[PDB]
Amino acid sequence: GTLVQILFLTLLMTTVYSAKDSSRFFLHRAIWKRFSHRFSEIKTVEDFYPWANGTLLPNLYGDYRGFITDGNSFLLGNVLIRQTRIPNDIFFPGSLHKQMKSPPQHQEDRENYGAGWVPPDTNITKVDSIWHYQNQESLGGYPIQGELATYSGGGYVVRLGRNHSAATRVLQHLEQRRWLDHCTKALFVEFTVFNANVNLLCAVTLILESSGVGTFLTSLQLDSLTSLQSSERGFAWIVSQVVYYLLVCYYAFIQGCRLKRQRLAFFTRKRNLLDTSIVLISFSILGLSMQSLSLLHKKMQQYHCDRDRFISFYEALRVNSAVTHLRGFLLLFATVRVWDLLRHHAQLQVINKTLSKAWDEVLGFILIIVVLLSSYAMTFNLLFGWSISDYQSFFRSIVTVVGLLMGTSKHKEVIALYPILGSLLVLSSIILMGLVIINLFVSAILIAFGK
Amino acid sequence: ELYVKTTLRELVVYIVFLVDICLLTYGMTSSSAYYYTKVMSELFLHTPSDSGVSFQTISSMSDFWDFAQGPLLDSLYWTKGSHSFIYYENLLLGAPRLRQLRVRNDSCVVHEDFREDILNCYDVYSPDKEDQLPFGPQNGTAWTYHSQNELGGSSHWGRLTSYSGGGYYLDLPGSRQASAEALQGLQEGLWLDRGTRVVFIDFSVYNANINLFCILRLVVEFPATGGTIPSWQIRTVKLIRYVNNWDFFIVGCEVVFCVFIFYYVVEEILEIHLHRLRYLSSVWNILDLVVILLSIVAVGFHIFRTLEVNRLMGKLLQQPDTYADFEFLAFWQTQYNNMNAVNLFFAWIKIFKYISFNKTMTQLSSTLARCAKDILGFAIMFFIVFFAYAQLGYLLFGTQVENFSTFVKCIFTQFRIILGDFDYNAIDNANRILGPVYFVTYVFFVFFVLLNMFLAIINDTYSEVKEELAG
Amino acid sequence: ELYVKTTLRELVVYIVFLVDICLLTYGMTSSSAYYYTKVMSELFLHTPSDSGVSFQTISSMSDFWDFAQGPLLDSLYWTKWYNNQSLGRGSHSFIYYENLLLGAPRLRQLRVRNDSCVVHEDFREDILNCYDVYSPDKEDQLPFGPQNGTAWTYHSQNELGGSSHWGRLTSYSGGGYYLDLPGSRQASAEALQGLQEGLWLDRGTRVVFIDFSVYNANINLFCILRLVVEFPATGGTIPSWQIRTVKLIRYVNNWDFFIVGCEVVFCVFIFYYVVEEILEIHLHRLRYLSSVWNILDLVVILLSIVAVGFHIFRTLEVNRLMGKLLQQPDTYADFEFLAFWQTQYNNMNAVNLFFAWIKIFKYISFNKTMTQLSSTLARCAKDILGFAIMFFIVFFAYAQLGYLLFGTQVENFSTFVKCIFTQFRIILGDFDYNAIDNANRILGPVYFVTYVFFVFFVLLNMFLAIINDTYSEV
Amino acid sequence: ELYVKTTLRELVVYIVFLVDICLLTYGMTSSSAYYYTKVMSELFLHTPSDSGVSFQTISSMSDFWDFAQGPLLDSLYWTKWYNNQSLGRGSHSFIYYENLLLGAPRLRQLRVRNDSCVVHEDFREDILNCYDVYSPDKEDQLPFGPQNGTAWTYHSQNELGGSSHWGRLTSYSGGGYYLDLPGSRQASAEALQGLQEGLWLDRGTRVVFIDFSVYNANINLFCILRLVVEFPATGGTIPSWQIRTVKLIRYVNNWDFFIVGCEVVFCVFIFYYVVEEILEIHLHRLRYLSSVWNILDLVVILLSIVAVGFHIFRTLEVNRLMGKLLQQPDTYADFEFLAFWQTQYNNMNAVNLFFAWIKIFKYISFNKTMTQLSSTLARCAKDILGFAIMFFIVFFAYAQLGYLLFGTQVENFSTFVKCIFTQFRIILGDFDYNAIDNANRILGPVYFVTYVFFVFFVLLNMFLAIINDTYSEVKEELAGQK
Numbered sequence A: 001g002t003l004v005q006i007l008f009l010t011l012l013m014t015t016v017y018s019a020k021d022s023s024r025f026f027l028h029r030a031i032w033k034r035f036s037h038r039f040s041e042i043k044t045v046e047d048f049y050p051w052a053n054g055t056l057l058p059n060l061y062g063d064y065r066g067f068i069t070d071g072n073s074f075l076l077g078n079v080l081i082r083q084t085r086i087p088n089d090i091f092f093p094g095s096l097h098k099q100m101k102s103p104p105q106h107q108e109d110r111e112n113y114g115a116g117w118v119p120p121d122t123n124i125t126k127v128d129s130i131w132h133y134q135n136q137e138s139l140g141g142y143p144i145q146g147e148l149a150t151y152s153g154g155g156y157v158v159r160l161g162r163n164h165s166a167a168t169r170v171l172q173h174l175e176q177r178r179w180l181d182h183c184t185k186a187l188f189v190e191f192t193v194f195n196a197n198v199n200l201l202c203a204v205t206l207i208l209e210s211s212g213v214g215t216f217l218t219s220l221q222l223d224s225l226t227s228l229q230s231s232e233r234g235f236a237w238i239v240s241q242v243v244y245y246l247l248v249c250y251y252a253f254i255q256g257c258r259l260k261r262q263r264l265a266f267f268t269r270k271r272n273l274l275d276t277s278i279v280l281i282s283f284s285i286l287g288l289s290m291q292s293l294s295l296l297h298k299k300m301q302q303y304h305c306d307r308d309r310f311i312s313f314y315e316a317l318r319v320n321s322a323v324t325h326l327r328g329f330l331l332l333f334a335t336v337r338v339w340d341l342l343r344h345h346a347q348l349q350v351i352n353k354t355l356s357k358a359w360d361e362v363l364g365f366i367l368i369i370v371v372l373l374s375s376y377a378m379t380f381n382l383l384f385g386w387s388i389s390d391y392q393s394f395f396r397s398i399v400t401v402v403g404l405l406m407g408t409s410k411h412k413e414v415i416a417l418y419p420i421l422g423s424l425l426v427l428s429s430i431i432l433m434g435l436v437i438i439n440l441f442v443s444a445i446l447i448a449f450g451k
Numbered sequence B: 001e002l003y004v005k006t007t008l009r010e011l012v013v014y015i016v017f018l019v020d021i022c023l024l025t026y027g028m029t030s031s032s033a034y035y036y037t038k039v040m041s042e043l044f045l046h047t048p049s050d051s052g053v054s055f056q057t058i059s060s061m062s063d064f065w066d067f068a069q070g071p072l073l074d075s076l077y078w079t080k081g082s083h084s085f086i087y088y089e090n091l092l093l094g095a096p097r098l099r100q101l102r103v104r105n106d107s108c109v110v111h112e113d114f115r116e117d118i119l120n121c122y123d124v125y126s127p128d129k130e131d132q133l134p135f136g137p138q139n140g141t142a143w144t145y146h147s148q149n150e151l152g153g154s155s156h157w158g159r160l161t162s163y164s165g166g167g168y169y170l171d172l173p174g175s176r177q178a179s180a181e182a183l184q185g186l187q188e189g190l191w192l193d194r195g196t197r198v199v200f201i202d203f204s205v206y207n208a209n210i211n212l213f214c215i216l217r218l219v220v221e222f223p224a225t226g227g228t229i230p231s232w233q234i235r236t237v238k239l240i241r242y243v244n245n246w247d248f249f250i251v252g253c254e255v256v257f258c259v260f261i262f263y264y265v266v267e268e269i270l271e272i273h274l275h276r277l278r279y280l281s282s283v284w285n286i287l288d289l290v291v292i293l294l295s296i297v298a299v300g301f302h303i304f305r306t307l308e309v310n311r312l313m314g315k316l317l318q319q320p321d322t323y324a325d326f327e328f329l330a331f332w333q334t335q336y337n338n339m340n341a342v343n344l345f346f347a348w349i350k351i352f353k354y355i356s357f358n359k360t361m362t363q364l365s366s367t368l369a370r371c372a373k374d375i376l377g378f379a380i381m382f383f384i385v386f387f388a389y390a391q392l393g394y395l396l397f398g399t400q401v402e403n404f405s406t407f408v409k410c411i412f413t414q415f416r417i418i419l420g421d422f423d424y425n426a427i428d429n430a431n432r433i434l435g436p437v438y439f440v441t442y443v444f445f446v447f448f449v450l451l452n453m454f455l456a457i458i459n460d461t462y463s464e465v466k467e468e469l470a471g
Numbered sequence C: 001e002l003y004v005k006t007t008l009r010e011l012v013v014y015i016v017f018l019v020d021i022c023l024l025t026y027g028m029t030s031s032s033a034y035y036y037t038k039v040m041s042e043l044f045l046h047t048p049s050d051s052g053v054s055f056q057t058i059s060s061m062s063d064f065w066d067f068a069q070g071p072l073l074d075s076l077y078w079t080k081w082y083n084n085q086s087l088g089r090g091s092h093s094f095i096y097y098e099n100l101l102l103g104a105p106r107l108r109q110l111r112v113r114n115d116s117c118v119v120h121e122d123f124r125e126d127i128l129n130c131y132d133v134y135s136p137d138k139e140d141q142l143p144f145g146p147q148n149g150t151a152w153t154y155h156s157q158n159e160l161g162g163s164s165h166w167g168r169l170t171s172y173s174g175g176g177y178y179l180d181l182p183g184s185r186q187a188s189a190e191a192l193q194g195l196q197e198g199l200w201l202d203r204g205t206r207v208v209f210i211d212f213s214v215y216n217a218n219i220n221l222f223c224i225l226r227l228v229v230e231f232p233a234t235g236g237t238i239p240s241w242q243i244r245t246v247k248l249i250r251y252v253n254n255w256d257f258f259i260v261g262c263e264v265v266f267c268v269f270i271f272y273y274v275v276e277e278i279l280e281i282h283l284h285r286l287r288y289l290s291s292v293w294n295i296l297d298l299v300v301i302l303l304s305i306v307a308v309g310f311h312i313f314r315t316l317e318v319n320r321l322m323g324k325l326l327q328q329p330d331t332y333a334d335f336e337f338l339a340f341w342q343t344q345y346n347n348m349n350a351v352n353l354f355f356a357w358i359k360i361f362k363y364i365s366f367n368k369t370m371t372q373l374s375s376t377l378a379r380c381a382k383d384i385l386g387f388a389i390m391f392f393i394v395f396f397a398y399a400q401l402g403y404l405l406f407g408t409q410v411e412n413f414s415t416f417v418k419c420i421f422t423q424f425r426i427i428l429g430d431f432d433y434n435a436i437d438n439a440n441r442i443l444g445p446v447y448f449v450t451y452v453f454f455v456f457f458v459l460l461n462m463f464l465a466i467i468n469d470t471y472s473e474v
Numbered sequence D: 001e002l003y004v005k006t007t008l009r010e011l012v013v014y015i016v017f018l019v020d021i022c023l024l025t026y027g028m029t030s031s032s033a034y035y036y037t038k039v040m041s042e043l044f045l046h047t048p049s050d051s052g053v054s055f056q057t058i059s060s061m062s063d064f065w066d067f068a069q070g071p072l073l074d075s076l077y078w079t080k081w082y083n084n085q086s087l088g089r090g091s092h093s094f095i096y097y098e099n100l101l102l103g104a105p106r107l108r109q110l111r112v113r114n115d116s117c118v119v120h121e122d123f124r125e126d127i128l129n130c131y132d133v134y135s136p137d138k139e140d141q142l143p144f145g146p147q148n149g150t151a152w153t154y155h156s157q158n159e160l161g162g163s164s165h166w167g168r169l170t171s172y173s174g175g176g177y178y179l180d181l182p183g184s185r186q187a188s189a190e191a192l193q194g195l196q197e198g199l200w201l202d203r204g205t206r207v208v209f210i211d212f213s214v215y216n217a218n219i220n221l222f223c224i225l226r227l228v229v230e231f232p233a234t235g236g237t238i239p240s241w242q243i244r245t246v247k248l249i250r251y252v253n254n255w256d257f258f259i260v261g262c263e264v265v266f267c268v269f270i271f272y273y274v275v276e277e278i279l280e281i282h283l284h285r286l287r288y289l290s291s292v293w294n295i296l297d298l299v300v301i302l303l304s305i306v307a308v309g310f311h312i313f314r315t316l317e318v319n320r321l322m323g324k325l326l327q328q329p330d331t332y333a334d335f336e337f338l339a340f341w342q343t344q345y346n347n348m349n350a351v352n353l354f355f356a357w358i359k360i361f362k363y364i365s366f367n368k369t370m371t372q373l374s375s376t377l378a379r380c381a382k383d384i385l386g387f388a389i390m391f392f393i394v395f396f397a398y399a400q401l402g403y404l405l406f407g408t409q410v411e412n413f414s415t416f417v418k419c420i421f422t423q424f425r426i427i428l429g430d431f432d433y434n435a436i437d438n439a440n441r442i443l444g445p446v447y448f449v450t451y452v453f454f455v456f457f458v459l460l461n462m463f464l465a466i467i468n469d470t471y472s473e474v475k476e477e478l479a480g481q482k
Ligand SMILES: *[C@@H]1O[C@H](CO)[C@@H](O)[C@H](O)[C@H]1NC(C)=O
Pocket: A053, A054
């Protein structure tokens, strides 16, 4: 009856909780402390050669046959340097002067070239030349959503892998031929590492995005994935995983039979919608969690075949992020179920004695909160949006205003910048909130005294 | 309850007006306007020279001369035409201009005990006491005085004196070694001497990818006590071009907005037929006039700014290598932005007048009228002690702490103490016997006043329901 | 009113006990115990080498061997004044010219076996070694390197009388590969050079301890220093430190010959209170455990008895340590066990004093001063007790969600307990939202704003149920 | 209603007295003081040496001699422009080209005796001497070093005319071993060398003061600098400083010839107020002491006569000091005593002005504005007193617990009153939870969480009792009205 349901729900929360290993944190931090050293001091396009000659090559080939730094993390395959350009229509601004510039976004210059950026020589596309737009498919890539872009895919590609000398040669050959020009948009440096002490595969991507004003926003992105076996752990977890999944399939059978003795009028019974979404999500989690490992094994066979070629693990990491989001959804579904089964088996009201849960009161409260947040967020973003960073955009300003409400974010720069406008706005907000709570108090007084 | 107020026509037309006014106000700004003030503010300020002298680190006159001949020229006249391009894209408009304001030699007569060790004495800056004579070689424009009428300029209410707009100026030449030799000649001769009171360095940059002017000025003040106080001002201007389709859409929104404010002003003047009856008694009939006035001044400044930017760019492309005054335009553009923000706030507020919400909000202004005469008797009784505390803080601290250095700064420091944002350690270090006492007693006073007015509020209704139930 | 309960004679004999406890635990502090740790910390952790590598910024093994030679021997062996003329005290090192250095430092290390894993079945022709994370089962106990000295052979925890350390990752053991530095600075530098040449910190290292002690005689205080560096299995280092200022020898001047009377009256009071508790147990044979103040009395008596026993233990141990230190110098005198247990004893005394202070409300009772809430919760317990339980159940979900979304980039969300305390600190208005914004630009704002709205809703409901209860029918 | 008690004559004469006292307390505080102290402080205790040793960074005896030679003389003695061209005014040090340098700086040191201790059995063969912490009973008064100059012989407080000093550890005496730096920079850079080749800072040292003062004449302001370095019994340093900008010479302007009349008016006003306070003592023999406004009037009159006396004292003292300074230069002119007492007089004036401003409430009166809390506490006095002492018992229990658990690691808990104010700040949402956590990561979170819960509980009880008593009494009077 209820014993099996509460046991199954406790086992489900145990399942979603027990997927915790702190070894994934430090790894990230470790890598982030090595390759992000002196990375923000890159403001031009010729300041990447000296940064990748003492902060990238030393940390990538740390006196070991393969391992990145201090052994531990192995370096899988090969390193890749990718670049996306814009068409060289700077012929119109012969001196980059001030006129009606910015043609329509200068979509990625996907055409071949020659020795320099000299026009091409033939009409075929080579897969080994630094000056040929390769593909998004033939590269096996994915749109790297940077800070202000999407960077739809591939571009012009070079590989500098597996030694220290074979990387210095490539860097010198790219510096002489002037590979990185003023026509370059974002430049990516991507590679991947497998740590075997704690079975963990990480994929690293260093991003340089060219802002409007001539400069470069620098970022670092890492994605991890634990490539453990089906079990390889304690029998308790294994026994707690098998029993939970058999309970899941039993509940699937139960709800299937309940839906055959009730054909279509099952939308109203929301007590079954949660219990069927839970079983669907659990089955999806298990299926994707094994499919990710199958994909990883396929790619590793591909690696063993033709070692010394760039290999991308983006599919496995995408499936892993999908699994994480599914777990995040299942958690809230489980808490909703636990809370709405503890309202009937032991009647505990929450909003009662002031419910007013009709379609008028709740909607009206939502509307007044939305209006009072939008107004303040808009005016704050307009006033201090050019200088302060917390009010840089509209939604950033909404989150900052909610913080102001909670007290998390203290408004001392809005008082330093505009001492009479920001002060007046904060005073208005305070007066409004005080009036609201005083009105609640006086209403609650007057309802229970006037009779 | 949730019900539409007066009419279903005025509500829809006002929703249209609000969407229009909230679309023509967000179309005169730039998403990359905060990344332009940060890239240009870290290039010219946080860039250390040899011996590590940024702009914010300037602390004497020799530091000023290490910043001028160092990271100031290296940032203006960039490396690898007839024109300079900072960061390969930005364009430096016109030519920079150093400007200095002196003070007369005999203005602050010395005391009797020292008038044999200290011969002459230079007062603090004041347009009454200002030197208008040539000095140094008395040769060029950097050594003679030019009034505010020749140097078309305006006051700069920057710090401590609201400085004037004339003075001794020099426009840096086009090259880099030429300007370096100019600054060397200005150093060997004593440009900055005891009489100097303030030095401005102002210039302007224009980006082409994004249409944005970054206009920046850097002020260094040499108080009567020696030293420096570096401050700065970096602003941005749009200069909308009418070549895209979105630009023509914005023009359409502007003409619709003009028609809307005209219709609203006629609808307002029409209902003054109730000459004084019930008109300036309603509160919304003040917000209407306020938003009308603001929306009029908006298009006024829009016309003015178009005219001024056209004149300035014409003067620039007519003859370069001369200072093109962009400070006026930038200052008044920021004023226009603030006015637009306030107008948008009020236009967002009026929706409450147009549509009714939960009975809580409709009785909120009835709750406010409860404390009818208690508040004017509370405002005075609170502000007397508030200002007593403000000046006590200004007198105890205010020589040591910065936030208490003047009166209005004490006012705002206490107002921030109310909001839980303070720095108790500076207060304590300033005076470790009357610091804690001041802090503790001030906080207790604030909490006492708040609790007292809350008691008065919720004790009003007891007597109200008592007299209405037993009357 | 303020009527006194159960007698006025007992309140006096308890106020005397309170004064005696305050004199006991406030006469053994030192006004100069904070500045001691301050100066020693800023001497050993903040001093930068050439290349600017202090102890707090160690991030490799090269950085370690850069600190262990530059700003560690310079900050340990003092033998000349600032004007380059010799101190008048020979063969001893007086740090800061006042602080004797007892014994000799000791570097210690905990390795991990070379084959403590099975590598993944795909990476077997590539990765030939796995070094698992630290645990006393997979711990290397074989010689390495030259395989001759004491720094290259494993000594168990019993040969090295020592105990566990609760580092920032796990709790380490007490064995390992140690080395006691010699007296002079040049001999110690040569020893450390020999340790660096033959590779001492290989891939299998997991911890490195550096422990030593210091005695200042002007004030009467020991300052036991321990500096730990942990090399996780994932890479990097996590430098940590523990600097404990304690008073082990505690009868020197005439003021400390006065506390030896308060200790006697204290044990007499403990005897009196236990013989009173036995009595009032003999008359309430089982009704005795319905007087929760009695649980507090038992707890206070137990803590006092433990604090009496630790005195005997510490006297014996410090006598043994001083004897061993003066008979054979040039060897590590283990002061860290004693310092740790002394600070634990101080913490227990602080808690016991707090309890003895709040035990005043057992005699002096007020009528209904702070009762206007317990009287409310006793009647309206359902929609305020169960509602609170529901809020608690809806909280832990948010803690787990925050550990899921973030928790690989942010640190406050790294573990479950850290998520719990980060949320509890969000309530009080103490948070850095930019971190969780950079970690995720779509779910960060959602998490934050929905959490804020939820906590506002809960506290508003509770305040409404509290204020509309007083106006119910009374 | 805003009815005024105390018939209008008294109100207008008090308004005139208030505007006069305000005029004469704001008319003698220059607005160019903050930047004076700012530039002098960031010149003297922010300038790194060749090794990166500012004043605040001093952390040993070998860093003092690094600062006291590199950036202490480069800042004191200015003799050339920034373009290597000699200043006009000769044989004088014009700091920042404007501020004079009055007299000659002075270095002073206080040592502690050699045998003020016991090592007591075990270190009595390794640690021969022991130097206690500073206290005037344990103080060395014998010559050391070459035992010849003034830097190596003790001069009692009365021979130096010194005075106490409330440092960061103790309060120090006024005597000690001193040295006056000479005129030029070279002559005073080889005087600080005989103090280093011979050990001036040895084990027995306990504090070193460096005092001097400058005078800017553009604005008319003195700036007195004192830089203290304390060497605790544990070794190390604790650098502290006190930089006081004062106006000791009053009348050099035309505005002041009007504050003379303001001072005369203030004197006749305080005379009138004391002569009218005599009458209320005559009429009410002992009913005078009933009200508390009379206590405040007595306090204000006492502070006024004290501020009148200090004026004469300061005039005499500054005349004597300027005479001695211009009569025999190259000697230390003690401006520190006068600067200290002048700042104390300014603080007293500020407090007195605050008292007058809040005393304005006994003349103009509101009807029932801020008696809403006074009227509802008089019905709960005997339980408010029982609530306060319970709250304070447990508050001080928590303060002791915090001082004992932390307090040798965290600085806010270093002492007892610091624990009190740290908790009072925790209430206002100003805490550093990471320091508490790292200090002790089992009892730290327990302390924090339980303290927050306790204070929340007591504020809830206070609010409940407050809003419950009023309802109780109003419904009680409505019931009794039946
Ligand atoms: C790269 O760095 C190494 C050492 O950091 C240096 O020897 C080499 O010359 C550098 N290469 C270039 C091209 O600067």
